[PDB]
Amino acid sequence: AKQDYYEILGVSKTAEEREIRKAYKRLAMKYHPDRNQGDKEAEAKFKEIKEAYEVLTDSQKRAAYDQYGHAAFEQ
């Protein structure tokens, strides 16, 4: 019911974007392909970790989950 965009990076539960940026920074470099092509999914993992960060600055995705997945803010 949406993904846990806090765990996908992996930070102190649901820490402010203040610390999420810090998770995102470590994890982004860790999961950067940097010629680890062919694998392809590891970059996709960086895509998820980006997605996570990005949802964590968004509006609706960011709250509906936090309350209740998508039975919160479907108006």
CSV table of N, CA, C and O in Angstrom, one decimal:
chain,number,residue,atom,x,y,z
A,1,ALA,N,0.9,-1.2,0.0
A,1,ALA,CA,0.0,0.0,0.0
A,1,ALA,C,0.9,1.2,0.0
A,1,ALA,O,1.0,1.9,1.0
A,2,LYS,N,1.5,1.5,-1.2
A,2,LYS,CA,2.7,2.3,-1.3
A,2,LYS,C,3.9,1.6,-0.6
A,2,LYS,O,3.7,0.6,0.1
A,3,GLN,N,5.1,2.0,-0.9
A,3,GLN,CA,6.3,1.5,-0.3
A,3,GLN,C,6.7,2.4,0.8
A,3,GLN,O,6.5,3.6,0.9
A,4,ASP,N,7.5,1.8,1.8
A,4,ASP,CA,8.1,2.5,2.9
A,4,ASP,C,9.3,3.3,2.3
A,4,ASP,O,10.4,2.8,2.3
A,5,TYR,N,9.0,4.5,1.9
A,5,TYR,CA,10.0,5.4,1.4
A,5,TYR,C,10.9,6.0,2.5
A,5,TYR,O,11.7,6.8,2.2
A,6,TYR,N,10.8,5.5,3.7
A,6,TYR,CA,11.8,5.8,4.7
A,6,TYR,C,12.8,4.7,4.9
A,6,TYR,O,14.0,4.9,5.0
A,7,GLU,N,12.3,3.5,4.7
A,7,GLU,CA,13.2,2.3,4.9
A,7,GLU,C,14.0,2.1,3.6
A,7,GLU,O,15.2,1.7,3.7
A,8,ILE,N,13.4,2.4,2.5
A,8,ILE,CA,14.1,2.2,1.2
A,8,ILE,C,15.4,2.9,1.2
A,8,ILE,O,16.4,2.3,0.8
A,9,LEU,N,15.5,4.2,1.7
A,9,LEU,CA,16.8,4.7,2.0
A,9,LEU,C,17.3,4.0,3.3
A,9,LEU,O,18.3,3.3,3.2
A,10,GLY,N,16.6,4.1,4.4
A,10,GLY,CA,17.0,3.5,5.7
A,10,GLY,C,17.6,4.6,6.5
A,10,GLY,O,18.8,5.0,6.4
A,11,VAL,N,16.8,5.2,7.3
A,11,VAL,CA,17.1,6.3,8.2
A,11,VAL,C,16.3,6.1,9.5
A,11,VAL,O,15.6,5.1,9.7
A,12,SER,N,16.5,7.0,10.5
A,12,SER,CA,16.0,6.8,11.9
A,12,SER,C,14.5,6.8,12.0
A,12,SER,O,13.9,7.8,12.5
A,13,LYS,N,13.8,5.8,11.5
A,13,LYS,CA,12.4,5.7,11.3
A,13,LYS,C,12.0,6.8,10.2
A,13,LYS,O,12.4,6.6,9.0
A,14,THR,N,11.4,7.9,10.6
A,14,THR,CA,10.8,8.8,9.6
A,14,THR,C,11.3,10.2,9.9
A,14,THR,O,10.6,11.2,10.0
A,15,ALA,N,12.7,10.3,10.1
A,15,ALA,CA,13.4,11.5,10.4
A,15,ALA,C,13.1,12.6,9.4
A,15,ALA,O,12.7,12.3,8.3
A,16,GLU,N,13.2,13.8,9.8
A,16,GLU,CA,13.0,15.0,9.0
A,16,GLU,C,13.8,14.8,7.7
A,16,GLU,O,14.8,14.2,7.7
A,17,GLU,N,13.4,15.5,6.6
A,17,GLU,CA,14.1,15.6,5.4
A,17,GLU,C,15.6,16.0,5.7
A,17,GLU,O,16.5,15.5,5.0
A,18,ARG,N,15.8,16.7,6.8
A,18,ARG,CA,17.1,17.1,7.3
A,18,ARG,C,18.0,15.9,7.3
A,18,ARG,O,19.1,16.0,6.8
A,19,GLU,N,17.6,14.7,7.8
A,19,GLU,CA,18.4,13.5,7.9
A,19,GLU,C,18.2,12.7,6.7
A,19,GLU,O,19.1,12.1,6.2
A,20,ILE,N,17.0,12.7,6.1
A,20,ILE,CA,16.7,11.9,4.9
A,20,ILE,C,17.8,12.3,3.8
A,20,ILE,O,18.3,11.4,3.1
A,21,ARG,N,18.1,13.6,3.7
A,21,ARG,CA,19.1,14.0,2.7
A,21,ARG,C,20.4,13.3,2.9
A,21,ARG,O,21.1,13.0,2.0
A,22,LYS,N,20.7,13.1,4.2
A,22,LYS,CA,21.9,12.5,4.6
A,22,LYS,C,21.9,11.0,4.3
A,22,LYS,O,22.9,10.5,3.7
A,23,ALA,N,20.8,10.3,4.6
A,23,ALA,CA,20.6,8.9,4.1
A,23,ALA,C,20.8,8.9,2.6
A,23,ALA,O,21.7,8.2,2.1
A,24,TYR,N,20.0,9.7,1.9
A,24,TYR,CA,20.0,9.7,0.4
A,24,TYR,C,21.4,9.9,-0.1
A,24,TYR,O,21.8,9.3,-1.0
A,25,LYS,N,22.2,10.8,0.5
A,25,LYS,CA,23.6,11.1,0.1
A,25,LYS,C,24.4,9.8,0.2
A,25,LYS,O,25.1,9.5,-0.8
A,26,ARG,N,24.5,9.2,1.4
A,26,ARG,CA,25.3,8.0,1.5
A,26,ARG,C,24.8,6.9,0.5
A,26,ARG,O,25.6,6.3,-0.2
A,27,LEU,N,23.5,6.7,0.5
A,27,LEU,CA,23.0,5.5,-0.2
A,27,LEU,C,23.1,5.8,-1.7
A,27,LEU,O,23.5,4.9,-2.4
A,28,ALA,N,22.9,7.0,-2.2
A,28,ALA,CA,23.0,7.4,-3.6
A,28,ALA,C,24.4,7.0,-4.1
A,28,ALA,O,24.5,6.4,-5.1
A,29,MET,N,25.5,7.4,-3.4
A,29,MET,CA,26.8,7.1,-3.8
A,29,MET,C,27.1,5.6,-3.7
A,29,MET,O,27.7,5.0,-4.6
A,30,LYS,N,26.6,4.9,-2.6
A,30,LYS,CA,26.8,3.5,-2.5
A,30,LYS,C,26.2,2.7,-3.7
A,30,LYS,O,26.8,1.8,-4.2
A,31,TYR,N,25.0,3.1,-4.1
A,31,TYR,CA,24.2,2.4,-5.0
A,31,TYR,C,24.3,3.0,-6.4
A,31,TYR,O,23.5,2.8,-7.3
A,32,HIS,N,25.4,3.9,-6.6
A,32,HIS,CA,25.6,4.4,-7.9
A,32,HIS,C,26.1,3.3,-8.8
A,32,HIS,O,27.0,2.5,-8.3
A,33,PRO,N,25.7,3.1,-10.1
A,33,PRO,CA,26.2,2.1,-10.9
A,33,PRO,C,27.7,2.2,-11.1
A,33,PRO,O,28.4,1.2,-10.9
A,34,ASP,N,28.2,3.3,-11.5
A,34,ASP,CA,29.6,3.6,-11.9
A,34,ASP,C,30.2,2.3,-12.5
A,34,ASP,O,30.8,1.5,-11.9
A,35,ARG,N,29.9,2.2,-13.8
A,35,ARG,CA,30.3,1.1,-14.7
A,35,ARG,C,29.8,-0.3,-14.2
A,35,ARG,O,30.0,-1.3,-15.0
A,36,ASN,N,29.1,-0.5,-13.1
A,36,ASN,CA,28.4,-1.7,-12.7
A,36,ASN,C,27.0,-1.7,-13.5
A,36,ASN,O,25.9,-1.8,-13.0
A,37,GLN,N,27.2,-1.7,-14.8
A,37,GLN,CA,26.1,-1.8,-15.8
A,37,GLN,C,25.9,-3.3,-16.0
A,37,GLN,O,26.6,-4.1,-15.5
A,38,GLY,N,24.8,-3.7,-16.8
A,38,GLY,CA,24.5,-5.1,-17.0
A,38,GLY,C,23.7,-5.6,-15.9
A,38,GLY,O,22.6,-6.2,-16.1
A,39,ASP,N,24.2,-5.4,-14.7
A,39,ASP,CA,23.4,-5.7,-13.4
A,39,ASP,C,22.1,-5.0,-13.5
A,39,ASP,O,21.0,-5.6,-13.6
A,40,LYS,N,22.1,-3.6,-13.6
A,40,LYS,CA,21.0,-2.8,-14.1
A,40,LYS,C,20.1,-2.5,-12.9
A,40,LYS,O,19.6,-1.3,-12.7
A,41,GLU,N,19.8,-3.5,-12.0
A,41,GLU,CA,18.9,-3.4,-10.9
A,41,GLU,C,19.5,-2.5,-9.8
A,41,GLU,O,18.8,-1.7,-9.2
A,42,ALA,N,20.8,-2.5,-9.6
A,42,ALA,CA,21.5,-1.7,-8.6
A,42,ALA,C,21.2,-0.2,-8.9
A,42,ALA,O,20.9,0.6,-8.0
A,43,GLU,N,21.3,0.2,-10.2
A,43,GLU,CA,20.9,1.6,-10.5
A,43,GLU,C,19.4,1.7,-10.2
A,43,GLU,O,19.0,2.7,-9.6
A,44,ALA,N,18.6,0.7,-10.5
A,44,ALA,CA,17.2,0.8,-10.2
A,44,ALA,C,16.9,1.0,-8.7
A,44,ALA,O,16.0,1.6,-8.3
A,45,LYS,N,17.8,0.4,-7.9
A,45,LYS,CA,17.8,0.6,-6.5
A,45,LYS,C,18.1,2.0,-6.1
A,45,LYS,O,17.4,2.6,-5.3
A,46,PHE,N,19.1,2.6,-6.7
A,46,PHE,CA,19.3,4.1,-6.6
A,46,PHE,C,18.0,4.8,-7.1
A,46,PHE,O,17.7,5.9,-6.6
A,47,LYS,N,17.3,4.3,-8.1
A,47,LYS,CA,16.1,5.0,-8.6
A,47,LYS,C,15.0,4.9,-7.5
A,47,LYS,O,14.4,6.0,-7.2
A,48,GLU,N,14.9,3.8,-6.8
A,48,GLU,CA,14.0,3.7,-5.7
A,48,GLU,C,14.4,4.7,-4.6
A,48,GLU,O,13.5,5.3,-4.0
A,49,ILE,N,15.7,4.8,-4.3
A,49,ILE,CA,16.1,5.6,-3.1
A,49,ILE,C,15.9,7.1,-3.5
A,49,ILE,O,15.6,7.9,-2.6
A,50,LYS,N,16.1,7.4,-4.7
A,50,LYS,CA,15.7,8.7,-5.3
A,50,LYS,C,14.2,8.9,-5.1
A,50,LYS,O,13.7,9.9,-4.6
A,51,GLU,N,13.4,7.9,-5.5
A,51,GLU,CA,11.9,7.9,-5.5
A,51,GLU,C,11.5,8.2,-4.1
A,51,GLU,O,10.7,9.1,-3.8
A,52,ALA,N,12.1,7.5,-3.1
A,52,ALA,CA,11.9,7.6,-1.7
A,52,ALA,C,12.1,9.1,-1.3
A,52,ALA,O,11.2,9.7,-0.8
A,53,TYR,N,13.3,9.6,-1.6
A,53,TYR,CA,13.6,11.0,-1.2
A,53,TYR,C,12.6,11.9,-1.8
A,53,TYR,O,12.1,12.9,-1.1
A,54,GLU,N,12.2,11.7,-3.0
A,54,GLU,CA,11.4,12.6,-3.8
A,54,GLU,C,9.9,12.5,-3.2
A,54,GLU,O,9.3,13.6,-3.1
A,55,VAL,N,9.4,11.4,-2.9
A,55,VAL,CA,8.1,11.2,-2.2
A,55,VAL,C,8.2,12.0,-0.9
A,55,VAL,O,7.3,12.7,-0.6
A,56,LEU,N,9.3,11.9,-0.2
A,56,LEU,CA,9.5,12.5,1.1
A,56,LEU,C,9.7,14.0,1.0
A,56,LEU,O,9.9,14.7,2.0
A,57,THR,N,9.5,14.6,-0.2
A,57,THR,CA,9.3,16.1,-0.3
A,57,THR,C,8.0,16.4,-1.1
A,57,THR,O,7.7,17.6,-1.3
A,58,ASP,N,7.2,15.4,-1.4
A,58,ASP,CA,6.0,15.6,-2.2
A,58,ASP,C,4.9,15.9,-1.2
A,58,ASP,O,5.1,16.1,0.0
A,59,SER,N,3.6,16.0,-1.7
A,59,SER,CA,2.5,16.3,-0.9
A,59,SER,C,1.7,15.1,-0.5
A,59,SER,O,1.7,14.7,0.6
A,60,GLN,N,1.0,14.5,-1.5
A,60,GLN,CA,-0.1,13.5,-1.2
A,60,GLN,C,0.5,12.2,-0.8
A,60,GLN,O,0.2,11.6,0.2
A,61,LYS,N,1.4,11.6,-1.7
A,61,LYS,CA,2.1,10.4,-1.5
A,61,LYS,C,2.7,10.4,-0.1
A,61,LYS,O,2.9,9.3,0.6
A,62,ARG,N,3.2,11.6,0.3
A,62,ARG,CA,4.0,11.7,1.5
A,62,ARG,C,3.2,11.6,2.8
A,62,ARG,O,3.7,11.2,3.8
A,63,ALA,N,1.9,11.8,2.7
A,63,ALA,CA,0.9,11.9,3.8
A,63,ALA,C,0.0,10.6,3.8
A,63,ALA,O,-0.2,10.1,4.9
A,64,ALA,N,-0.6,10.3,2.7
A,64,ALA,CA,-1.5,9.2,2.6
A,64,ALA,C,-1.0,7.9,3.2
A,64,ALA,O,-1.6,7.3,4.1
A,65,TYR,N,0.2,7.6,2.8
A,65,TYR,CA,1.0,6.5,3.4
A,65,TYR,C,1.1,6.6,4.9
A,65,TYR,O,0.8,5.6,5.6
A,66,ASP,N,1.5,7.8,5.3
A,66,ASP,CA,1.9,8.0,6.7
A,66,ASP,C,0.8,7.8,7.6
A,66,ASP,O,0.9,7.2,8.7
A,67,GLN,N,-0.4,8.3,7.2
A,67,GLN,CA,-1.6,8.1,7.9
A,67,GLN,C,-2.0,6.6,7.7
A,67,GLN,O,-1.9,5.8,8.7
A,68,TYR,N,-2.4,6.2,6.5
A,68,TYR,CA,-2.9,4.9,6.2
A,68,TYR,C,-2.8,4.6,4.7
A,68,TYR,O,-3.9,4.7,4.0
A,69,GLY,N,-1.7,4.3,4.1
A,69,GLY,CA,-1.5,3.8,2.8
A,69,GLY,C,-2.2,4.6,1.7
A,69,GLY,O,-1.6,5.6,1.3
A,70,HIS,N,-3.3,4.2,1.3
A,70,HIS,CA,-4.3,5.0,0.5
A,70,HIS,C,-5.7,4.7,0.9
A,70,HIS,O,-6.5,4.2,0.1
A,71,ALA,N,-6.0,5.0,2.2
A,71,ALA,CA,-7.3,5.1,2.8
A,71,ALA,C,-7.1,6.2,3.8
A,71,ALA,O,-7.2,5.9,5.0
A,72,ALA,N,-6.9,7.4,3.4
A,72,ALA,CA,-6.5,8.6,4.2
A,72,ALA,C,-6.9,9.8,3.4
A,72,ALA,O,-7.8,10.6,3.9
A,73,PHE,N,-6.3,10.0,2.2
A,73,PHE,CA,-6.4,11.2,1.5
A,73,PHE,C,-6.6,10.9,0.0
A,73,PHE,O,-5.8,11.2,-0.8
A,74,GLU,N,-7.8,10.3,-0.3
A,74,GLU,CA,-8.2,9.9,-1.6
A,74,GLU,C,-9.3,10.9,-2.1
A,74,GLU,O,-10.1,10.6,-3.0
A,75,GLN,N,-9.4,12.0,-1.4
A,75,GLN,CA,-10.2,13.2,-1.8
A,75,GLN,C,-9.1,14.2,-2.2
A,75,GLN,O,-8.4,13.8,-3.2
